[PDB]
Amino acid sequence: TNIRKSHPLMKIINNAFIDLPAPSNISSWWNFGSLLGICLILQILTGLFLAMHYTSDTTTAFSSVTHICRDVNYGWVIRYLHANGASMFFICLFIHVGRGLYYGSYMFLETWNIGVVLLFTVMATAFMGYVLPWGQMSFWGATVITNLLSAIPYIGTDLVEWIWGGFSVDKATLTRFFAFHFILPFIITALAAVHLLFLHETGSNNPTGISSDMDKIPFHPYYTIKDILGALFMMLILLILVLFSPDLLGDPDNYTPANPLNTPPHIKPEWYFLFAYAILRSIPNKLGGVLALVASILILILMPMLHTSKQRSMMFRPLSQCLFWMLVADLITLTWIGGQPVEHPFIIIGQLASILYFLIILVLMPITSIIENNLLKW
Amino acid sequence: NVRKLSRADLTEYVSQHYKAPRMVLAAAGGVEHRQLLDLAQKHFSSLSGTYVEDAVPAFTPCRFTGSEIRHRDDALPLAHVAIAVEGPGWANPDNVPLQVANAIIGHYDSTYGGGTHMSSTLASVAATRKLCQSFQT
Amino acid sequence: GREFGHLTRMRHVITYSLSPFEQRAFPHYFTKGIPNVLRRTRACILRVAPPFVVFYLVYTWGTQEFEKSKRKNPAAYEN
Amino acid sequence: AVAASSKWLEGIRKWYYNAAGFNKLGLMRDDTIYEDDDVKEAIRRLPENLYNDRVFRIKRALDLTMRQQILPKEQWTKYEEDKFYLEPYLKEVIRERKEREEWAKK
Numbered sequence: 214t215n216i217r218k219s220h221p222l223m224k225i226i227n228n229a230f231i232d233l234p235a236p237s238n239i240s241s242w243w244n245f246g247s248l249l250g251i252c253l254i255l256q257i258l259t260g261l262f263l264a265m266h267y268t269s270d271t272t273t274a275f276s277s278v279t280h281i282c283r284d285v286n287y288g289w290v291i292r293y294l295h296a297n298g299a300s301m302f303f304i305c306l307f308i309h310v311g312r313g314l315y316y317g318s319y320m321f322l323e324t325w326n327i328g329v330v331l332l333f334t335v336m337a338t339a340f341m342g343y344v345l346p347w348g349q350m351s352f353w354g355a356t357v358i359t360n361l362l363s364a365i366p367y368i369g370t371d372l373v374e375w376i377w378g379g380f381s382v383d384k385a386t387l388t389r390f391f392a393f394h395f396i397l398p399f400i401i402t403a404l405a406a407v408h409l410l411f412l413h414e415t416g417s418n419n420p421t422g423i424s425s426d427m428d429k430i431p432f433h434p435y436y437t438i439k440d441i442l443g444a445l446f447m448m449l450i451l452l453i454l455v456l457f458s459p460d461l462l463g464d465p466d467n468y469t470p471a472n473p474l475n476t477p478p479h480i481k482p483e484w485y486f487l488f489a490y491a492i493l494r495s496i497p498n499k500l501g502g503v504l505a506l507v508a509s510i511l512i513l514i515l516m517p518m519l520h521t522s523k524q525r526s527m528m529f530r531p532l533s534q535c536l537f538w539m540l541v542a543d544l545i546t547l548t549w550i551g552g553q554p555v556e557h558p559f560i561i562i563g564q565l566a567s568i569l570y571f572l573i574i575l576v577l578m579p580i581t582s583i584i585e586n587n588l589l590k591w
Numbered sequence: 592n593v594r595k596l597s598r599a600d601l602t603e604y605v606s607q608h609y610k611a612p613r614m615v616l617a618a619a620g621g622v623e624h625r626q627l628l629d630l631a632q633k634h635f636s637s638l639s640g641t642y643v644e645d646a647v648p649a650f651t652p653c654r655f656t657g658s659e660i661r662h663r664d665d666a667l668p669l670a671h672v673a674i675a676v677e678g679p680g681w682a683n684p685d686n687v688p689l690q691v692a693n694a695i696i697g698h699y700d701s702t703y704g705g706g707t708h709m710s711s712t713l714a715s716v717a718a719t720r721k722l723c724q725s726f727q728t
Numbered sequence: 729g730r731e732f733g734h735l736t737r738m739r740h741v742i743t744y745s746l747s748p749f750e751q752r753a754f755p756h757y758f759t760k761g762i763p764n765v766l767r768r769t770r771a772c773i774l775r776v777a778p779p780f781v782v783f784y785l786v787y788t789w790g791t792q793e794f795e796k797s798k799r800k801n802p803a804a805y806e807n
Numbered sequence: 808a809v810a811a812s813s814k815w816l817e818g819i820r821k822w823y824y825n826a827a828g829f830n831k832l833g834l835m836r837d838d839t840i841y842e843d844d845d846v847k848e849a850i851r852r853l854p855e856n857l858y859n860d861r862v863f864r865i866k867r868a869l870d871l872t873m874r875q876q877i878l879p880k881e882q883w884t885k886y887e888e889d890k891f892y893l894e895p896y897l898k899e900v901i902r903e904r905k906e907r908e909e910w911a912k913k
C-alpha cells in the first residue's frame with residue numbers, strides 16, 4: 214500500500230516536513246531561520262579540521278595557525294571560512310529576533326523561552342574561543358573580562374583562579390578554554406532540536422495576525438523550493454566577502470605573537486559585542502556594572518506579559534510603528550559609540566542610549582498601546 | 592433566459608432546424624418495407640427540400656483545457672469527484688481498444704455479492720478497507 | 729492530530745483555476761513592477777526614514793567637533 | 808471632559824481610521840481582534856448567517872496580500888456603516904468569569 218504512511222521512519226518525516234498545513238502569505242522574513250541551520254552544519258564541519266592541527270601549547274599555539282595558513286593544501290581557504298562564517302551566523306540572529314517583536318511572535322511562551330537560553334550559549338562560545346588564537350587581543354581581553362567576575366564580594370577570589378590554573382594565562386588555561394569550545398557546541402544542537410517540538414501543535418503564523426485554518430496549503434512543493442532558492446543565494450555573498458576582501462571584518466592585531474611585554478593601545482573586540490560592552494564601561498561601580506550587563510538578555514523574558522493591545526502585529530497599528538524604528542537606531546548609535554576612545558561627548562551620548570534602550574520598552578511601549586486602544590474602541 | 596424567450600424566437604427555431612435531410616424515419620418489429628415507404632410518401636412529401644436561408648454552420652474542432660472547479664458546502668454527508676482527459680471522436684478507429692482497456696478497471700458498489708475478492712485490483716482493495724460507496728468509468 | 733481532514737468549517741464558497749502548462753509566466757512584468765513600488769514606497773518612506781534621520785546629525789556633530797579639538801588644539805593652547 | 812472642543816476630537820477619530828489600513832483590504836473592525844480564550848467562546852455563539860460572512864471576508868482579504876494589490880477605491884468599507892456585531896456577545900463571557908472568581912475568593 215502507501216509506504217509513505219506505514220513505515221516507522223517515514224511517518225516522522227512526512228508529518229514533519231513534507232505534509233504539514235502551512236499558511237499562504239508568509240513573508241520572506243519567515244525565510245531566515247532555515248539559513249541559520251545551514252550555518253550550524255558548516256561551523257561544526259569546518260571547525261574540526263582546525264582542532265586536528267592546533268596545539269594547546271602556550272608557547273606553541275600562535276605558530277600553529279601561522280603554519281596552517283601557509284603549510285597545507287587549501288588551509289588558507291578553510292581558516293577564513295571559519296573566521297567569516299560566524300560574522301554572519303551573528304547577522305542572522307538579529308533579524309530572526311527583531312521580527313518576533315513585529316509579528317507578535319512571543320505569545321508562544323514555550324517557543325520563546327527555549328530561545329533566550331540558546332542566545333546566551335551561542336554568544337558565549339565565540340568569546341570563549343576567540344581568545345585561543347593566542348594573540349595580544351586574545352590575552353588582553355581575557356584578562357579584562359576575567360577581572361570583572363572577580364569583583365563579587367565573596368564569590369570573586371576563588372572562581373577566578375580555577376579557570377586560570379594558577380595566577381595568569383599559562384599551559385593550565387589555554388587547555389581548558391580549548392576544553393570549552395568542543396562541548397558548548399554539541400550541547401547547543403540538542404536545544405535546537407527541542408525548539409521545534411513546541412512548534413508542531415500550534416502551526417506557523419502569518420503577517421496579518423489572524424488565525425487562518427481556512428486556507429492552509431502544503432509545505433512540499435512550495436516551501437521546499439522557495440527555501441532552496443534563497444539558500445543558494447547566501448553562498449553568493451558569503452563567498453564574495455571571503456574570496457575578494459577577507460581582511461575587511463577583522464583587526465590587524467592578532468598577528469604579533471602573544472607577549473606580556475607589550476600591551477595593545479586601542480583594545481576593542483569585534484563589532485558584534487561592542488553593544489553589550491558599551492553599557493558596561495558606561496557606568497562606574499564595578500559590582501553594579503556587571504549586573505547591568507546581564508539585565509539585557511533577561512530584559513527579554515519580561516516582555517510577553519507587558520503586552521497591552523487588543524490586536525496582533527504592527528501592520529494595523531500605525532502609531533506604534535514609530536517606536537520600533539527608534540529602537541534599532543538606538544542600537545546603531547550604541548554600536549558606533551563603543552569601538553572608539555573616550556572623549557567629551559562620547560560619555561554623555563552613549564549614556565542616553567543606555568537610559569533609552571530601557572525607557573522605550575519598559576515605560577513607553579506598554580503606555581502608548583492604550584492611547585490607540587481608546588481610538589478603535591478595542 | 593427561460594423567462595423572456597417568446598413566440599417569435601420559437602417559431603423561427605422550428606422553421607430553421609426542423610427540416611430534411613436532417614431527419615430519419617425509423618421503424619422496427621413486424622413492419623413491411625414497401626408499405627412503410629408507400630405510407631411515407633403520402634404524409635411526408637409535402638415538405639421543403641431546398642435549404643431555407645442557406646444557414647450552413649461550419650464545424651469548429653473542440654478546444655480542451657486543463658482547469659479545476661471546487662465547491663465547498665460543508666454540511667452534506669458525502670463527497671463527489673470526477674476526473675477526465677481528452678479522447679477520440681465518433682468515427683475514429685481507436686475506440687475499440689479503449690473499450691477493451693476501460694473494461695479492465697471495472698466498477699463496484701457496496702451492495703455487490705462477492706466483493707473482496709473479485710478480479711479488479713481496485714475493487715478488491717476498496718471492498719476490504721472500506722473506502723468507497725461506489726465508482727465507475 | 730491536526731492534519732488536512734479536521735479544521736475550520738466553511739460553506740457556500742467556490743474557486744476556479746487553470747494549469748501551468750496552458751499559461752505564460754510573465755504577464756507584463758516590466759509594465760506592472762514599477763507602479764507598485766511607486767505607490768508603496770511613498771507610504772513607508774516616511775515611516776522608516778525620520779527615526780533614522782536623527783543619527784546623521786549627532787554623528788556628524790560629534791565627529792567634526794572632536795576633529796576640531798584634536799587637529800586644532802594649538803588654537804586654544806595659548807602662549 | 809470637554810464638549811465643544813470634542814468636535815475637534817471626533818476629527819482625529821476619522822484620521823486614525825484612515826491611517827490603519829484594515830478598511831483598504833475590505834475588512835470591518837471586529838475582524839482584527841486577537842483570539843485568546845475569552846474570544847474563542849463568544850465566536851461559537853454567533854448565528855449562522857453572521858458566522859459565514861466573517862469567513863468569506865477573511866479568506867478574500869488574506870489572498871490579496873500574497874498577491875500584493877489592494878481593492879478598488881469605491882470598494883473600501885465606508886467609515887460610518889461599519890458594524891460592531893460582536894461587542895454584545897463578548898461583554899457577557901467576561902462578565903460571567905469575574906463571577907466564578909469572587910465566588911472562589913470570598
Ligand code: HEM
Nearest residue numbers: 256257260263264267278296299339342343346394395398
Ligand atoms: C557555534 C559553533 C562555533 C562557533 C560560533 C565558533 C567560533 C569560533 C571562532 C570565532 C573562532 C576564532 C578563529 C579565529 O579567529 O581564527 C574559533 C576557533 C576555533 N574553534 Fe570554533 N566555533 C564553534 C564551534 C567549534 C567546534 C564545534 C569546534 C570543535 C569541535 C571548534 C574548534 C575550534 C578551534 C580548534 C579553534 C582554533 C583554530 C583557529 O583559531 O584557527 N569550534 N571558533
Ligand code: HEM
Nearest residue numbers: 243244246247249310313318325328329331332405417418
Ligand atoms: C541557534 C539559534 C536558533 C535557531 C537555530 C533557531 C531556529 C528557528 C527555526 C528553524 C524556527 C522555525 C522556522 C521559522 O519560523 O522560520 C524558529 C522560530 C522561532 N524562533 Fe528560533 N532559532 C534560534 C534562536 C532563537 C532566539 C535567540 C530566539 C529569541 C527569542 C528565537 C525565537 C523564535 C521564535 C519566536 C520563533 C517563532 C517563529 C514564528 O513566528 O513562527 N529563536 N527558530
